[PDB]
Each structure stands twice: as structure tokens, then as C-alpha cells.
Design a protein around this ligand. Sequence first.
Ligand SMILES: [Zn+2]
Length: 378
Amino acid sequence: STGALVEEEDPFFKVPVNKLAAAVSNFGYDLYRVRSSTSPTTNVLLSPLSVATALSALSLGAEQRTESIIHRALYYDLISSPDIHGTYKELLDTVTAPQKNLKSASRIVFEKKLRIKSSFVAPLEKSYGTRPRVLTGNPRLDLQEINNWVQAQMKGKLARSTKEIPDEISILLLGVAHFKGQWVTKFDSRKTSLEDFYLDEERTVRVPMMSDPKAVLRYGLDSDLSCKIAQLPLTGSMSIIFFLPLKVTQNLTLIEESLTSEFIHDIDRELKTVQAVLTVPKLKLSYEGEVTKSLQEMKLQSLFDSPDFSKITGKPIKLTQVEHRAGFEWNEDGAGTTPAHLTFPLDYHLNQPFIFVLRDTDTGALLFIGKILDPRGP
Ligand SMILES: [Zn+2]
């Protein structure tokens, strides 16, 4: 009984920037689901906000039908906003503020010699703080310039791309993000040690495992999903929510099917503070790849056929590539250290495949999502 335009009753989602954050985050969970389906045996690491942002910005140059196609994928058609792009600037300003430890940037890149209308550039730069790049047609220079842009946006925290530049670009969208933050409570690195990680029912590896035997966290068991949910706070009003299956498995699909902005808000409200025997693997992960094909499965295929971008230029152009680069890291770093007496202990050992969601507490925005089949790497 959903899909109708109704007034928002949930207080957290009445806030326009939170309503927008929930919309583009729901695009991000959609993209995550497609990628995870495509990658049943490899880690999935995504920061889809940078991709949603490139698409939202590009929709400024779309005529009405194409614009609506982009807006439907971003869930804008369920918002009743007079200023979607003004709200977006606020969203971006909030989640990339310095305390968030999150670098995120989106770029629109056009085929060589394209003449761009200043009536596109002006709202693009105002709301998204970005300017379109027109390629030169020299593959070496063009790849060097894009990597130099990623380097400056990410302050060198991502690896430069040794990937060849695509041969036939009309519109290329680039979404890049890096996150390395600090826990509210540091892990004692003296307690970090090599421990078993159950890749699956038959394969066990040894991985640097952080440990807090007396962790305070927020926790809840979701019986319907057979998974233990824990939330660990980060400095700068963010948290990581973990989804830990009860049985060793790489099949997280049932959990993945539930991931929406509204589900995650509900989970967050329902978690309760407990003490836990907590283990968390160290993570230093990176991803570089094209999400072109995944977006084509997300009702965006017509952007690649004959879309109408005549608000950008008179020359017929179309989406040809959407690139994502992401880097993500967590270690023991944190801001601080911490006749009967009864406790309620729980174990929370992330020593088997799990999903994590890095969420902004203020807006609820999805900042990063990982399916971690193997904490060592790809
Ligand atoms: Zn609520």
C-alpha cells in the first residue's frame, strides 16, 4: 500500500535535507544490491552518494522526460521539494564537512569540442560546486587530467588509476570518495592480533582482528534476517552499522533485500545499548570500476540510448560511462579510551562475511557501504 504521495509523518524524514538524503541513499542501496549480485565472491565497496550526485547534477541538463528518468532512479518523485538542488548543496556541505573525514566528489566529463551552455554550467556550479570537463581528444592528457582531478579532490588518499581511458566518450560521470575516520572509542592496538576469519564453511584465513572485550555499542538481533546488528559510533556524528549473519555464509541476499533508508532509520531507533565482546577486522580497501552496466539494470538504460540533454548543448549527446572509485579504511584509532552487579554479555565477532553501512547521523545519508567477504582485500 505504498507509492502514493503522502505527507511525511516520520519526524526524522520531514527535514528536507534528511528526506533528500533518504532518497539518494535509497538509490545507493539499489546500486549496492545490483553490485553485490554481480559480485557474489568478491568484496563490494561503494560510496554511491558520489554517483547519485553526478546523476543529480547531470539531470540539470536534461529535458523533461530524461530528467524524470534520472529523478525516478534517485527517488525524487517521492519528494515534494521546490528546490531539490538547493537542498542537495546543503546535503553535500553537511556530509563532507571536515569532521566527517569523508572526501566525496562528482564530475561530468564531455566529448571533445563540445560547446556547453552557460545556463547549464551556472546551476551546476551553484548547487554542486563542480564544473564540466571537456576532453581534448588526446588520451594521455585526458587520463592524466582526470587522475589529477581525482588526486586534488581526494587529497591523494586514493590510488591513481592506471586504467585506460575509454575510447568513445559522450558523457562520462565520475564519482569518487574516500573515508578514514576515528571511532569514538579507540581499540587498544595491544589487543589487535591475528585471528581466524571464516571466508565460508570450508575456508579459514588469518586476519588482523581488533578487539574490545568490553565494548559498549548498540545492538539488536533481527530474527527474520538471521543476523546480529551492531552500531559503533565514529567521531563527527557518524556511525557504522554492522550486519552479522548468525551462520557462516557468503549469502547475504536476504539482508541486502531489506536495506533501505527507512529500514536503516528504524533499525537505528530500535538498537539498544549493551556491552559486547567485540572483534572487528582492520580494513583498508579500495575499489575502482565502472558501474555503467549496473545503472543500466536500475531503469537508467535510456540515458545510454537517445536521451535529450539539449539543456547542455545542441549536439545530441548521451551517457556512455559511469566510473566509481572508492577508498575505505578503519584501524584502532579513536578519540578516547572509554552486593551484586549484573551484566548482560553478548558476543559480536566480525570473523565471517558481513555488511557494514557508514551513515551520517545528522542527515541519515549513506556514506559508504561494504560487503566484506574477505577483510584482507578484493
Ligand atoms: Zn523516525
